[PDB]
Structures are given as C-alpha cells and as structure tokens.
Amino acid sequence: SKISKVLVANRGEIAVRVIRAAKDAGLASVAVYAEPDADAPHVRLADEAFALGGQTSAESYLVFEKILDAAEKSGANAIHPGYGFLSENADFAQAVIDAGLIWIGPSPQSIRDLGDKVTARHIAARAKAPLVPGTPDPVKDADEVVAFAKEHGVPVAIKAAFGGGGRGMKVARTLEEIPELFESATREAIAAFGRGECFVERYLDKPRHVEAQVIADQHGNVVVAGTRDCSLQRRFQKLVEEAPAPFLTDAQRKEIHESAKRICKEAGYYGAGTVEYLVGQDGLISFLEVNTRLQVEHPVTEETSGIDLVRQQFKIANGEPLDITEDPTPRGHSFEFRINGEDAGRGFLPAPGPVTKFVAPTGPGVRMDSGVETGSVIGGQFDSMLAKLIVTGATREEALERSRRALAEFTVEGLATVIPFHRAVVSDPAFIGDGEKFDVHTRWIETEWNNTVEPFTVPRQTVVVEVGGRRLEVSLPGDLAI
Amino acid sequence: SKISKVLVANRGEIAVRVIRAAKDAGLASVAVYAEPDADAPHVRLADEAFALGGQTSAESYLVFEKILDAAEKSGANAIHPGYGFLSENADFAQAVIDAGLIWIGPSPQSIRDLGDKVTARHIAARAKAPLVPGTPDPVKDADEVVAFAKEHGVPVAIKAAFGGGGRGMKVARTLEEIPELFESATREAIAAFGRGECFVERYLDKPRHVEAQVIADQHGNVVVAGTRDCSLQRRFQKLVEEAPAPFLTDAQRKEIHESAKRICKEAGYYGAGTVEYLVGQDGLISFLEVNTRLQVEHPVTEETSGIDLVRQQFKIANGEPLDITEDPTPRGHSFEFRINGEDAGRGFLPAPGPVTKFVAPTGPGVRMDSGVETGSVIGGQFDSMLAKLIVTGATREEALERSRRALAEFTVEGLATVIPFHRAVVSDPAFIGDGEKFDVHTRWIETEWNNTVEPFTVPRQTVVVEVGGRRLEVSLPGDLA
C-alpha cells in the first residue's frame, strides 16, 4: 500500500526533521522513544508516540522486539529509517517488506551488495570511478604489507569489508609500523564485529572528503543534486562542512558527477542517498563509499540546488514516476556546523550537561535545526551531536560573516560545546579560502590548527546604567555594599 | 566617505533585521530606544544603544534632533531609514547631509519625488506606465468631482495625496455619494497631516497588487532583482507576500520590468526601490507605486534572490558600482506572513499585552523575522507587529503545505495574535489557484474566509554628575542598594 501513515524507526535530531516532513504531509506521524526522549520535541510533536523503554541505544532502538511491537501497535504503513541505527540493514528492509510497509530506502540486495565493502569496491571498480591503487581482496599479513609499501610507496591503509561506525581501519606511515598495525586493524575488527575480511590500498596524507547527494527511483533512474566538501572534522568525525566547494577544478567536478552515476547504477541504488569520495590535495579524487543512508548535512545540497532531498525518498519508495531528469544549477556558497557536546578545550573529550538556556538565529540566509531543547541532559549514551547550524551567502567570506552572528545569537549554558570554537575556525586565515587552494583537511583542528579555548570547570547582580544616555550593563558582587 | 558605524532608528523587526545586516557585514551598530524598549531584543542585540526616552513612540521618534544627537554621540557615521518614522522624510535626509552623516537611502530629490504618490503618478503618465487613468493631475474641486464621476463613471476612488498605509483613501459606488467622500477625505487628511492635497480617479473592482524590486548604481548599473504579490489583504493592508510574483505571465512581467526601467530612468533613479502595480483578476496591469523604503516584504526576495539587500544597500551607499547587474531568475515560490497583534476571534480588533509566551517556527523552508521575544510587552503605542513568518519551497504547493505546518507550529500566548488567522487563510481554498488563474481578490478574506477562532480568556532614577563642571546626566534603576 502507498505511503499513508509514517513510522520513524529512529531517534536523534533526524526524528525531529522526519516529524517535520510527516506533519508537512499531513498524515499520522509516529515515533518511538526511550525514556530520555519521551519529552523530546519530536516525541511530543508526533501525532502518536510509543515507548521503547531503556536509556541506551542497545536497550531500545536497535533490537527487533520493540520496533516490531511498535510496527504492530502504531498501525503505520510506511517505515522510514534515518542516519545511523537500523537504516543500514538489508534484513530490516526485508522485515519492512515482510511487514508490508513502504521501505523508504534502497532495495535489500543493493543494501547488502553495498554493505559488503569489498563488493562496494567491486562496484566502484566495475563502474570505473576514480580509484586509489588498492587491493581487490584482503591481504594476508603485515610483512607482505611492508612489501606492498616497498612496491607502492608509503603510507598504506587497511579497511574492513564489514562493520563500521568510525571503526575497522588502520594505517602505516612507515614500513616498520606495519608488523603490528595490520594485526591492530584485524584485532580491532574481530573484537568489535568478528569479521576478518579486511583489504588494503595506497593511502593519502592530509586527506579530504567529498560526497554527492543522489535521488534514485525504484524504477531505476537517477538525478545528482550536488556535493559537499567535508574537510573540517573532529578526530575524523564531522564538525564543519561546506557546499559548493569553490576550489574543485571543473574537469574533476565533471569526473565526480559522472562517477557517482556509474557507481550508483552498478550498485542498483534507489531512494535518496549519498555517494562518497576520498579526495587528495594533489588533485587525486577516489571513491570511498556510498553511504547507504541519509546524512545530517542534506540542507546545504537542498538549498544550493533548490530541491528538497527527503521527500524524494517518499515519491521513490511509493514507486510513482520520477518528476526530474537533469542536474540543477548551483547558487552561491554555504557552511554547516554540527554542534557537539564535547570538551573542545581538552581535545573534544565527551562531557555531559544540561542545556539551561537556548537562543535561535533568525533572519536571512541562516537556518537551524535543533536536536535538543532546554532541560535535555546530554551524555555518552548516543553519538555526540546537538544541532545543525546553516549559513549561506554569495561567497565563503559572506558565510564567514553570517556565522559570527549565528554563533553569537546561538548559545546554551550549563555544558561544554563547540560554539566558542567554531568562531575562530570561521575567522581563521588558514581556514578562509584564498581563491586558489583549500588549506583545511580532515582532522585539521587536531593535526594543525591552533585551538584557543580554556577547558570547562554567589549570583551577580546585573544592572543597566546609562551614562550620557549610552546604555551599559554592570555586573556587581553578590555582597556589594558600602 | 564610507560606512563604518551604522545607527538604525526604528522600532522592532526592521531594527533587528538591519542590525542583523550590520552584524553580518561586521559593521559597528548603534541602537536607540524608547522607555518600553529599554530592554528590547534590538537594544540587547546592538553593539551600542542609546535612550531616546519617552513612554510612546510619538513622544520621541519624530524628533530629528533626538536622533542626530545620538548619532554624533555614538559616532554613527551612517544612519539607516528602515521603514516608517523618518525613513522617507526629506527633512531628515537634509539633516543627515548637513550634519555630514551617511544617509543609507535615496537622495533628497529621489524621496521628495516619491513620498507623495501623486508625484509618482505624474511621472508614471510620462513614463507610459499602465495607469488607473482617471486624471494624472487632481481635479480642482467637488464641483468637478461630481462632473468627473458622472463623466468617467462611478465607482470613484477619493484619495489623499499622502494617504498611504491604506487609510487615507475612499471608494464610492454611486454618483450621489461622491461629494461626502471627498469632504470626508479632505477633512480627515487635514486632521492627520495638515496638508489637504487630494485626488480622484476611477476605481477598479478586482485589482491585485504586484511590485518589483529595483537596484540602481552611482555608476549607473540597474537591476530588477525580483517580484512580489500582495493579494491577501484585510482591513486594507498588506499582510501576506508571495514571491516571485505568482499568476503573472511574461506579457505582464515584460511591462512590470520595462516600465520600471523607464520610470526609474525618468526618475533619474539610483539606490534601491520597488515599482508597484495592481493587476486585475483578468491580468490587466494598472499602477500604484514606485517605492523607496526597504519594503518590509524583503525576506522572500532575500531568500529567492542571491542578495542580502541591505548589504547591497551598503555597497550602493558606498558608491560602489553594482556587482549585481543581471535581471535574475527567481527560484520557485515563497510565502511570508505579518504576525500581527490582533484577536482574530474578536473581529481582528487590536490586542495589546505581555508576550508571556513566544515560539516562532524554524527549520528548512521556513524563516522568522522575530522582532519580539518571550516576556516582552506589546501594545499600540508602537508598530502593530510582533514578528513576521516567512516560507519558501520549490513551488506554491510545497510552500503551502510548509505554510500550513509552520502556522500550526507558530504559537504565541498571553495576548491574541493573527497567527490563527494565518493558519485559517492558509487553509482557505480560494488562495490555491488552478495554474492559470486563482480566485483570491481584494476583500476576499473579509467576504469569503471561514473564521474559526475562540476568544482568549521601580521607576528609573536620573542623577546628574559633573566632570570638571561638564554636565553628564546618568541614569540608574530606582534602587541599587
């Protein structure tokens, strides 16, 4: 049956956006929640909502028992996964098919053929996308990777064929590191996931990442919506992203536009999703993944293309014929900033705390979406995200203009955040584009850029005074007298 | 010679919007406030702020000296008009030029020629812009009013030369009615403005308002940067904007732009502005304005076109040649709503009160010009709006569903607001056209809309200090012990 009542099979700030989309569509919108989320904006904005119980992802969202019980009791007829969680699961796409709900995602066989990251590389090689020189099958041992580095040069990097989530990868920068770090890559892979399929490629120093958003019909037709550069990151995890990237060269942007299509048609991908590339400073572009899931930073492709990305997943999963055929015209520049609850003065050590106040940027060219609101107590129970921040202008320096106010009107207190940090990287002569190069790279903060924030650790009176009519505010000790 | 510190003297939303523009541009920014505004969002956002004093706007914001004193005490090398108050009074353009401060606005001539809309009509006749023909000059007296109404045919519109905001104007259906409307118009005009200049022209039964933005350069570049439609109206005011202008063909858009180029060249125009039209439900263009304030309707053009329009105003006031020189193609569609302080459950009677709650919508496709904040206080002593809601999408359909949801989200409590009217009118079908025409016309809300709303149920101290005998008035709260 066509999409007619929607169940969100996810939490996190995406659950808010999905209730926005569903309550746009005016259908009964359903979400499931852990106890900390029972008060969340999305949980209370949903038309109906259901408890999973528990207080952690393994207690609640990931197990089948409670999502199955919700898929019974909600009476929904479309199942929408988001980023992370069960979105990656071809057996969940199958379970949605066996429940009979519209699967807002790619086909189960495309899901597994891309979930196998060795078949995903066979996909990329068969599509003949730009590729790093790298092995088509797992290499047996470390001193053979030393021989690999003697033949191919050094660094070399090993990736798992299965498993994910920031895990299952390691690198050698000199050949004498290889004897322990091939074993380290496999030891971590078996300890986390039990899978032994791990394979090697020649690696890149100061590496960069670019991702192409794709809309793709169940009947097999495709539109490419745009690309993000993602070089500003925390410990190789997202922080600040930009779209369009001014300094990719035209013929390589063509190559990025065509390789996405070739890889997607090889993988059979459909719905809406993202194709990803490992990118170098030396003008090397290489495929890295097709993400198999939606991404946080969809808006800077949406608003620079003029097309909504999430609602195509609806039309495509319903199987009705696609209404677009050709790549849209770009406009301007934009930045996105992921707000993290992390002690950025200590190297982003994750730390808890309440949002005791919240203030939202408004006016032109700056948009937000918020995963948290006042009273939310944050902690390590989930991936460390707090909010979107979106800034756009005719050029990078005009988004660097607007983001200063964005980070001055946006504030929360009672917890550590990236908000003091973002302003400096926004204002930095190395992060600003000269017109000719990037000079920002993944893990750029921890590997080069000079951080400046002191680490996080009776009431003042605060009173207005007017002097000559000039307004001032004065902070006065809690025992000021005589 | 160039902008370096900007003072914007207006109340609320536009003050925030252009202080935001300065904060973006990195300009130094100075606010001014009356007594109810001493802790307003604008005074707490600006980098500096100065009291004008006074309990209500009319006690203070009209005084040129009270502005220019704050300008020179702050060192605001630039002053912005915004909309309302002094934004379009040449007395202030003179005062700013004689004081030697940057007027962020069109020249004294360029305002003098357009503050009275009669002078815009007198240009328009020469520009061949589509008129509501009547006569370009006003007729002499009621003896001619009855003769012209009998000659041209009632209904006739009777209008004060300065009657803008939809309240200096009248319409009559029959040839016996018109002399009483012409007297009423003249004496109410004398009561509101002292001047008595009044004109008469044939009325239009189903016009629709449209306007187009124009940007013009000290180096002579000109750009027609976008279009907007203002058909949804209640108590004869603009309240919803739609952009780029919908339900207009290229055969309309052609003259809407090309008569704007001609009429702005005939005005010698430089700086930003708009040209405004009434289009019939049959699509037949006729005139209303060429407009020189930054129209409050700016958000939908700010989102559909690649311009921070006041940043472009900064560059134009800088005398820079325009770096926008192409008549653009506006994306998709967008809606915007004026979030008025009126009780839609009570005939839209005005409703003051404390803003004990304010929550305004966020996320993709929706924007806010919040000019008020939680715990503030509202009343008719100042401008009528709390804020504005703004919506955009790839086409009306998407922006319409986004509007219905956005207005179902937008929540204010402690006073009545027009937000539930917006929710209702965004549901009422006549606004949703067929693809070649649409059914909404003037008076449509107050004639066809389905109403559903239920009625809701220390002082400061001044001390004087002297520094070497130079006086310095200081003010503090009435207690600090």
PDB file of C-alpha atoms in Angstrom, chain A residues 274-437:
ATOM      1  CA  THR A 274      24.891   9.912  -0.926  1.00  0.00           C
ATOM      2  CA  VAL A 275      27.912   8.786  -2.943  1.00  0.00           C
ATOM      3  CA  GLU A 276      31.239   9.498  -1.298  1.00  0.00           C
ATOM      4  CA  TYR A 277      34.804  10.151  -2.462  1.00  0.00           C
ATOM      5  CA  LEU A 278      38.199  10.212  -0.806  1.00  0.00           C
ATOM      6  CA  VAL A 279      39.919  13.339  -2.141  1.00  0.00           C
ATOM      7  CA  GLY A 280      43.550  14.446  -2.030  1.00  0.00           C
ATOM      8  CA  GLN A 281      45.438  17.724  -2.073  1.00  0.00           C
ATOM      9  CA  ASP A 282      47.429  16.605  -5.140  1.00  0.00           C
ATOM     10  CA  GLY A 283      44.358  16.561  -7.358  1.00  0.00           C
ATOM     11  CA  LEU A 284      43.563  12.910  -6.669  1.00  0.00           C
ATOM     12  CA  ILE A 285      39.890  12.012  -6.367  1.00  0.00           C
ATOM     13  CA  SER A 286      38.913   8.487  -5.349  1.00  0.00           C
ATOM     14  CA  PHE A 287      35.684   6.740  -4.445  1.00  0.00           C
ATOM     15  CA  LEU A 288      35.452   5.898  -0.768  1.00  0.00           C
ATOM     16  CA  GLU A 289      31.866   4.762  -0.100  1.00  0.00           C
ATOM     17  CA  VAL A 290      28.220   5.001  -0.974  1.00  0.00           C
ATOM     18  CA  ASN A 291      26.890   5.764   2.451  1.00  0.00           C
ATOM     19  CA  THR A 292      23.770   3.536   2.290  1.00  0.00           C
ATOM     20  CA  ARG A 293      21.971   6.079   4.489  1.00  0.00           C
ATOM     21  CA  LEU A 294      20.809   9.686   4.738  1.00  0.00           C
ATOM     22  CA  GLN A 295      23.133  12.349   6.145  1.00  0.00           C
ATOM     23  CA  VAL A 296      22.864  15.248   8.575  1.00  0.00           C
ATOM     24  CA  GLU A 297      24.101  17.927   6.138  1.00  0.00           C
ATOM     25  CA  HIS A 298      21.429  17.396   3.459  1.00  0.00           C
ATOM     26  CA  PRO A 299      20.351  21.083   3.730  1.00  0.00           C
ATOM     27  CA  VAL A 300      23.405  22.644   2.035  1.00  0.00           C
ATOM     28  CA  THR A 301      22.681  20.468  -1.015  1.00  0.00           C
ATOM     29  CA  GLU A 302      18.946  21.181  -0.795  1.00  0.00           C
ATOM     30  CA  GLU A 303      19.196  24.968  -0.600  1.00  0.00           C
ATOM     31  CA  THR A 304      22.048  25.193  -3.149  1.00  0.00           C
ATOM     32  CA  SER A 305      20.118  23.014  -5.639  1.00  0.00           C
ATOM     33  CA  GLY A 306      16.603  24.345  -4.955  1.00  0.00           C
ATOM     34  CA  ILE A 307      15.246  20.827  -4.360  1.00  0.00           C
ATOM     35  CA  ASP A 308      14.067  19.025  -1.216  1.00  0.00           C
ATOM     36  CA  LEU A 309      16.054  15.797  -0.677  1.00  0.00           C
ATOM     37  CA  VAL A 310      13.981  13.859   1.897  1.00  0.00           C
ATOM     38  CA  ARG A 311      10.562  13.912   0.143  1.00  0.00           C
ATOM     39  CA  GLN A 312      12.060  12.291  -2.940  1.00  0.00           C
ATOM     40  CA  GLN A 313      12.570   9.210  -0.781  1.00  0.00           C
ATOM     41  CA  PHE A 314       8.785   9.253  -0.314  1.00  0.00           C
ATOM     42  CA  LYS A 315       7.943   9.557  -4.022  1.00  0.00           C
ATOM     43  CA  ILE A 316      10.546   6.929  -4.987  1.00  0.00           C
ATOM     44  CA  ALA A 317       9.558   4.434  -2.320  1.00  0.00           C
ATOM     45  CA  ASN A 318       5.972   4.835  -3.471  1.00  0.00           C
ATOM     46  CA  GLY A 319       7.172   3.892  -6.954  1.00  0.00           C
ATOM     47  CA  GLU A 320       5.486   6.711  -8.816  1.00  0.00           C
ATOM     48  CA  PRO A 321       7.419   8.016 -11.818  1.00  0.00           C
ATOM     49  CA  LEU A 322      10.143  10.497 -11.005  1.00  0.00           C
ATOM     50  CA  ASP A 323       9.463  14.119 -11.931  1.00  0.00           C
ATOM     51  CA  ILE A 324      13.045  15.313 -12.573  1.00  0.00           C
ATOM     52  CA  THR A 325      15.734  14.259 -15.056  1.00  0.00           C
ATOM     53  CA  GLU A 326      18.621  16.789 -15.113  1.00  0.00           C
ATOM     54  CA  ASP A 327      21.143  18.277 -12.684  1.00  0.00           C
ATOM     55  CA  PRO A 328      20.131  21.693 -11.214  1.00  0.00           C
ATOM     56  CA  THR A 329      22.059  24.997 -11.441  1.00  0.00           C
ATOM     57  CA  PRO A 330      24.183  25.834  -8.315  1.00  0.00           C
ATOM     58  CA  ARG A 331      23.919  29.064  -6.321  1.00  0.00           C
ATOM     59  CA  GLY A 332      26.387  30.862  -4.010  1.00  0.00           C
ATOM     60  CA  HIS A 333      28.162  29.295  -1.010  1.00  0.00           C
ATOM     61  CA  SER A 334      27.167  27.713   2.320  1.00  0.00           C
ATOM     62  CA  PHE A 335      28.585  26.330   5.581  1.00  0.00           C
ATOM     63  CA  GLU A 336      27.129  23.785   8.040  1.00  0.00           C
ATOM     64  CA  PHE A 337      28.200  23.422  11.692  1.00  0.00           C
ATOM     65  CA  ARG A 338      27.444  20.330  13.811  1.00  0.00           C
ATOM     66  CA  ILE A 339      27.099  21.392  17.458  1.00  0.00           C
ATOM     67  CA  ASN A 340      28.882  18.856  19.696  1.00  0.00           C
ATOM     68  CA  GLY A 341      28.565  18.417  23.460  1.00  0.00           C
ATOM     69  CA  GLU A 342      32.336  17.874  23.755  1.00  0.00           C
ATOM     70  CA  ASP A 343      35.110  19.431  25.862  1.00  0.00           C
ATOM     71  CA  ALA A 344      36.869  21.127  22.946  1.00  0.00           C
ATOM     72  CA  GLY A 345      39.425  22.629  25.354  1.00  0.00           C
ATOM     73  CA  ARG A 346      40.724  19.117  26.130  1.00  0.00           C
ATOM     74  CA  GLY A 347      40.736  17.627  22.622  1.00  0.00           C
ATOM     75  CA  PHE A 348      36.969  17.073  22.433  1.00  0.00           C
ATOM     76  CA  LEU A 349      36.664  14.820  25.459  1.00  0.00           C
ATOM     77  CA  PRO A 350      32.915  13.999  25.537  1.00  0.00           C
ATOM     78  CA  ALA A 351      31.308  15.509  28.624  1.00  0.00           C
ATOM     79  CA  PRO A 352      27.716  15.733  29.908  1.00  0.00           C
ATOM     80  CA  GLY A 353      25.410  18.534  30.875  1.00  0.00           C
ATOM     81  CA  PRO A 354      22.049  20.329  30.825  1.00  0.00           C
ATOM     82  CA  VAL A 355      21.019  22.861  28.206  1.00  0.00           C
ATOM     83  CA  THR A 356      19.958  25.591  30.675  1.00  0.00           C
ATOM     84  CA  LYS A 357      19.134  28.213  28.005  1.00  0.00           C
ATOM     85  CA  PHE A 358      18.652  28.193  24.226  1.00  0.00           C
ATOM     86  CA  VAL A 359      18.631  31.067  21.686  1.00  0.00           C
ATOM     87  CA  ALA A 360      17.964  30.669  17.951  1.00  0.00           C
ATOM     88  CA  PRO A 361      19.429  32.626  14.999  1.00  0.00           C
ATOM     89  CA  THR A 362      16.868  34.032  12.560  1.00  0.00           C
ATOM     90  CA  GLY A 363      16.676  36.409   9.601  1.00  0.00           C
ATOM     91  CA  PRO A 364      18.167  35.896   6.140  1.00  0.00           C
ATOM     92  CA  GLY A 365      20.379  33.113   4.878  1.00  0.00           C
ATOM     93  CA  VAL A 366      20.896  31.421   8.257  1.00  0.00           C
ATOM     94  CA  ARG A 367      18.855  28.347   9.181  1.00  0.00           C
ATOM     95  CA  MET A 368      18.871  25.887  12.067  1.00  0.00           C
ATOM     96  CA  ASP A 369      17.544  22.569  13.143  1.00  0.00           C
ATOM     97  CA  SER A 370      17.853  21.587  16.771  1.00  0.00           C
ATOM     98  CA  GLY A 371      18.174  18.112  18.232  1.00  0.00           C
ATOM     99  CA  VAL A 372      17.894  19.402  21.817  1.00  0.00           C
ATOM    100  CA  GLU A 373      15.916  21.910  23.859  1.00  0.00           C
ATOM    101  CA  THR A 374      16.191  23.326  27.370  1.00  0.00           C
ATOM    102  CA  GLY A 375      16.108  20.626  30.053  1.00  0.00           C
ATOM    103  CA  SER A 376      17.783  17.959  27.900  1.00  0.00           C
ATOM    104  CA  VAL A 377      20.560  16.290  29.920  1.00  0.00           C
ATOM    105  CA  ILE A 378      23.277  15.147  27.476  1.00  0.00           C
ATOM    106  CA  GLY A 379      25.693  12.264  27.898  1.00  0.00           C
ATOM    107  CA  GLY A 380      27.608   9.457  26.242  1.00  0.00           C
ATOM    108  CA  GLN A 381      24.558   7.283  25.576  1.00  0.00           C
ATOM    109  CA  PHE A 382      24.456   8.378  21.903  1.00  0.00           C
ATOM    110  CA  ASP A 383      26.609   9.951  19.207  1.00  0.00           C
ATOM    111  CA  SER A 384      27.674  13.363  20.446  1.00  0.00           C
ATOM    112  CA  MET A 385      25.516  15.581  18.177  1.00  0.00           C
ATOM    113  CA  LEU A 386      23.447  18.537  19.402  1.00  0.00           C
ATOM    114  CA  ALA A 387      22.232  20.616  16.436  1.00  0.00           C
ATOM    115  CA  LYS A 388      22.536  21.824  12.871  1.00  0.00           C
ATOM    116  CA  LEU A 389      23.744  25.293  12.023  1.00  0.00           C
ATOM    117  CA  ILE A 390      23.371  26.509   8.424  1.00  0.00           C
ATOM    118  CA  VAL A 391      24.835  29.671   6.864  1.00  0.00           C
ATOM    119  CA  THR A 392      24.690  30.778   3.237  1.00  0.00           C
ATOM    120  CA  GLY A 393      25.795  33.724   1.141  1.00  0.00           C
ATOM    121  CA  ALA A 394      27.142  34.694  -2.247  1.00  0.00           C
ATOM    122  CA  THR A 395      30.636  33.607  -1.155  1.00  0.00           C
ATOM    123  CA  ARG A 396      32.607  31.809   1.540  1.00  0.00           C
ATOM    124  CA  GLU A 397      33.583  35.057   3.279  1.00  0.00           C
ATOM    125  CA  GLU A 398      29.902  36.097   3.389  1.00  0.00           C
ATOM    126  CA  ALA A 399      29.051  32.862   5.168  1.00  0.00           C
ATOM    127  CA  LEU A 400      32.016  33.583   7.452  1.00  0.00           C
ATOM    128  CA  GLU A 401      30.299  36.946   8.016  1.00  0.00           C
ATOM    129  CA  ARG A 402      26.932  35.416   8.964  1.00  0.00           C
ATOM    130  CA  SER A 403      28.324  32.578  11.109  1.00  0.00           C
ATOM    131  CA  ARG A 404      29.782  35.056  13.637  1.00  0.00           C
ATOM    132  CA  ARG A 405      26.270  36.228  14.493  1.00  0.00           C
ATOM    133  CA  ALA A 406      24.986  32.677  14.193  1.00  0.00           C
ATOM    134  CA  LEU A 407      27.405  31.654  16.976  1.00  0.00           C
ATOM    135  CA  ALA A 408      26.682  34.823  18.999  1.00  0.00           C
ATOM    136  CA  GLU A 409      22.877  34.591  18.940  1.00  0.00           C
ATOM    137  CA  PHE A 410      23.064  30.808  19.269  1.00  0.00           C
ATOM    138  CA  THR A 411      24.067  29.934  22.802  1.00  0.00           C
ATOM    139  CA  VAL A 412      23.451  27.373  25.507  1.00  0.00           C
ATOM    140  CA  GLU A 413      24.875  27.314  29.007  1.00  0.00           C
ATOM    141  CA  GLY A 414      25.499  24.695  31.649  1.00  0.00           C
ATOM    142  CA  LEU A 415      27.554  22.478  29.339  1.00  0.00           C
ATOM    143  CA  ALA A 416      30.643  22.378  27.125  1.00  0.00           C
ATOM    144  CA  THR A 417      30.185  22.872  23.389  1.00  0.00           C
ATOM    145  CA  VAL A 418      31.970  23.702  20.139  1.00  0.00           C
ATOM    146  CA  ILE A 419      30.254  27.113  19.971  1.00  0.00           C
ATOM    147  CA  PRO A 420      33.266  29.104  21.282  1.00  0.00           C
ATOM    148  CA  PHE A 421      35.498  27.086  18.947  1.00  0.00           C
ATOM    149  CA  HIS A 422      33.586  27.500  15.685  1.00  0.00           C
ATOM    150  CA  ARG A 423      34.049  31.289  15.608  1.00  0.00           C
ATOM    151  CA  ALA A 424      37.857  31.001  15.487  1.00  0.00           C
ATOM    152  CA  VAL A 425      37.991  28.470  12.643  1.00  0.00           C
ATOM    153  CA  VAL A 426      35.396  30.598  10.855  1.00  0.00           C
ATOM    154  CA  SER A 427      37.702  33.593  11.358  1.00  0.00           C
ATOM    155  CA  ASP A 428      40.991  31.847  10.623  1.00  0.00           C
ATOM    156  CA  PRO A 429      43.351  32.986   7.809  1.00  0.00           C
ATOM    157  CA  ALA A 430      44.176  29.319   7.203  1.00  0.00           C
ATOM    158  CA  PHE A 431      40.557  28.164   7.059  1.00  0.00           C
ATOM    159  CA  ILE A 432      39.432  31.042   4.848  1.00  0.00           C
ATOM    160  CA  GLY A 433      39.769  30.362   1.139  1.00  0.00           C
ATOM    161  CA  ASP A 434      42.428  32.390  -0.645  1.00  0.00           C
ATOM    162  CA  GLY A 435      40.772  31.685  -4.019  1.00  0.00           C
ATOM    163  CA  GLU A 436      43.294  29.044  -5.106  1.00  0.00           C
ATOM    164  CA  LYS A 437      43.524  26.200  -2.553  1.00  0.00           C
TER     165      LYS A 437
END
